[PDB]
Design a protein around this ligand. Structure first.
Ligand SMILES: [Zn+2]
Lengths: 77, 60, 113, 176, 80
RNA sequence: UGGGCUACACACGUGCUACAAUGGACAAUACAAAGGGCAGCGAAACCGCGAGGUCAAGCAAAUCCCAUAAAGUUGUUCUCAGUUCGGAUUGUAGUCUGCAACUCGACUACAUGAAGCUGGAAUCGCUAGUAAUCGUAGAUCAGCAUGCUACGGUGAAUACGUUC
């Protein structure tokens, strides 16, 4: 690739918080949070509300509402 | 008032809040007094005829 | 200077605290009673320990920028869900069921005759 | 390169066994991914095209090529040479990263998602997916999105048939 | 009703129609006139054709729509 | 059954609230009249900062309740500042009625704190317990009154004159 034209690119771990499922891939989201990975190096983490392993269409199961959500507050009521 | 509307007011309402008062002499829905079950117009006419006990023109 | 915002120096502490976004009269009095400080003492004639206690009490009240972000997030959520309140926020009209035939200036801006 | 490793290990073997390829060189692979955004309203406001280019660059990771009108059209008020689109070509590791990201992080963010069209094959082993909201992609913050616009993602494969392309994309994890 | 001591209101017929066919993943569209019914978490992912006066506007239920009424997503008046 | 009558680039009438020091806030303490109450007026007590909720006495009325009137008076503070004025607007969280407060109720708590610093041309009411100010009650009414109809507290200025 040419130098100085492309946006900054780096490895990141997308973490589906619903299932606490982590997947490594490149992106340019540059989250401050850092986490360790099975390889010795550590890369920043991108929080993700819904993912392939959590979406109902992909999974075949009903999705689980997250904490502090609308459903949780409604049930607390 | 409409005969159907008077009949519907008289009939029992599935709701309870759905009950409203109509003048029982002419059927006007507005301005019906509770003590007489009359609208203002019928009240005036009957007070003039003297057929509402103890009701007379007021002044002070 | 509390919560990252300066407050009038010559104003009594209870009133001067209301200048903090998210702090009104009632919360100002509650904070002042929790962190024991004279009601009538002006902020200029105030002690560093009192100021520190006031800061400690204030930091946990979720005021200023965090409060603004929360309100904006609520408004954005109701706009995004396509609610009636969201549509009225988008159109800049009263949201709480007022009558717009007249008297909707605070939401509609100045009169465009 | 998790997706590339999956292709090398599992998808290769599955597809080869399914289609009875005498040689490994017959195993289809995803040649490239072209992400195109056609901005016809750039005629009226070039700032729209600039924002579209910025968003596409954020999504893809590399600067897009600006595509200009091939011919002049009176009805669209389009003059030859006016920039009316953006396009990015992804190959190799960047392509695989974008593909897995699209499959996992991006696609489920579609409201009322029910899978992607299984008939969206050109007839020769290439698949075109029409996304209708840039906001799908994780790298974009809705605050900075002045306008919402879609994209065409063309996955160009070496498969000679729609059947083989479908098998390859399914093994990769494409919903349908 | 609105008071907390009373549970969030919802028409019994609407709630039971939603509950029916819950197990099956081929959930269909539910025609309803109940603009007043509250949206429960049980409704998430469903499609309600809510009558706004002349036609049933389709409404798709998401997580952020929990706690609101079905009528808030079926506008009744038209302007411009 | 559901939605209009509650729309909203706009013009007009009638009103409520203000723009402040003859005032704002806080605490203490007085003085009315006139009405309503049967499944209706809901005392005291307890719970909640709150609107209110639980128990519940009395009362079909000169007996009990609605129901402590406010302005005022006396003390502390603010010191002329778009503010400790003003309270629209909006967020969140609640109470009550009602099968049901999204369209489209009232009220309460926290925060948010808009215009407005006495209003151009013009124009309205009022001659005395009147105007002006301050509260209070009632019909309608499940709920909803700045409207309407009544009540009282404090309480003025001016009328030369008939030219227009
Ligand atoms: Zn009559």
């Amino acid at each position: 690739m040419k130098q100085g034209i492309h946006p900054e690119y780096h490895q990141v771990i997308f973490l589906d918080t619903t299932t606490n499922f982590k997947f490594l891939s490149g992106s340019t989201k540059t989250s401050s949070e850092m986490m360790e990975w099975e390889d010795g190096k550590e890369y920043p983490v991108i929080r993700l509300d819904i993912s392939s392993d959590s979406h109902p269409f992909y999974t075949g199961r009903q999705k689980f509402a997250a904490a502090d959500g609308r459903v949780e507050r409604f049930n607390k009521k | 008032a409409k005969t159907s509307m008077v009949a519907k007011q008289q009939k029992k309402q599935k709701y309870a809040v759905r009950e409203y008062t109509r003048c029982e002499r002419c059927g006007r829905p507005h301005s019906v007094y509770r003590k007489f079950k009359l609208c203002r117009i019928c009240f005036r006419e009957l007070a003039y005829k003297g057929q509402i006990p103890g009701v007379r023109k007021a002044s002070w | 200077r509390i919560a990252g915002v300066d407050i009038p120096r010559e104003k009594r502490v209870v009133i001067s605290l209301t200048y903090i976004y998210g702090i009104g009269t009632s919360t100002a009095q509650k904070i002042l009673e929790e962190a024991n400080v004279s009601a009538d003492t002006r902020v200029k004639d105030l002690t560093d320990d009192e100021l520190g206690r006031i800061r400690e009490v204030v930091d946990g009240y979720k005021v200023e920028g965090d409060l603004r972000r929360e309100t904006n997030l609520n408004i954005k959520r109701l706009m995004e869900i396509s609610s009636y309140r969201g549509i009225r926020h988008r159109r800049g009209l009263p949201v709480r069921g007022q009558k717009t035939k007249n008297n909707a200036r605070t939401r509609k801006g100045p009169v465009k005759t | 390169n998790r997706l590339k490793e999956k292709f090398n290990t599992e998808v290769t073997e599955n597809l080869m066994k399914k289609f009875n390829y005498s040689s490994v060189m017959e195993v289809p692979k995803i040649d490239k991914i072209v992400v195109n955004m056609g901005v016809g309203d750039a005629v009226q406001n070039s700032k729209v095209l600039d924002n579209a280019v910025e968003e596409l660059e954020l999504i893809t990771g590399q600067k897009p090529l600006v595509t200009k009108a091939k011919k002049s059209i009176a009805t669209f008020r389009l003059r030859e040479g006016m920039p009316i689109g953006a396009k990015v070509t992804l190959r190799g590791e960047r392509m695989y990263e974008f593909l897995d990201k699209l499959i996992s992080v991006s696609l489920p963010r579609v409201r009322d998602f029910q899978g992607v069209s299984k008939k969206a094959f050109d007839g020769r082993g290439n698949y075109t997916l029409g996304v209708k909201e840039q906001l799908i992609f994780p790298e974009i913050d809705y605050d900075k999105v002045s306008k919402v616009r879609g994209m065409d993602i063309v996955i160009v494969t070496t498969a000679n048939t729609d059947e083989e392309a479908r098998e390859l994309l399914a093994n990769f994890g494409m919903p349908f | 009703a609105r008071s907390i001591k009373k549970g969030p209101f919802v028409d019994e017929h609407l709630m039971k129609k939603v509950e029916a066919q819950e197990g099956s993943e081929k959930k269909q569209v539910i025609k309803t006139w109940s603009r007043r019914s509250t949206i429960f978490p049980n409704f998430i992912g469903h499609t309600f054709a809510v009558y706004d006066g002349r036609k049933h506007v389709p409404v798709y239920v998401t997580e952020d729509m929990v706690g609101h009424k079905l009528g808030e997503f079926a506008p009744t008046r038209t302007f411009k």
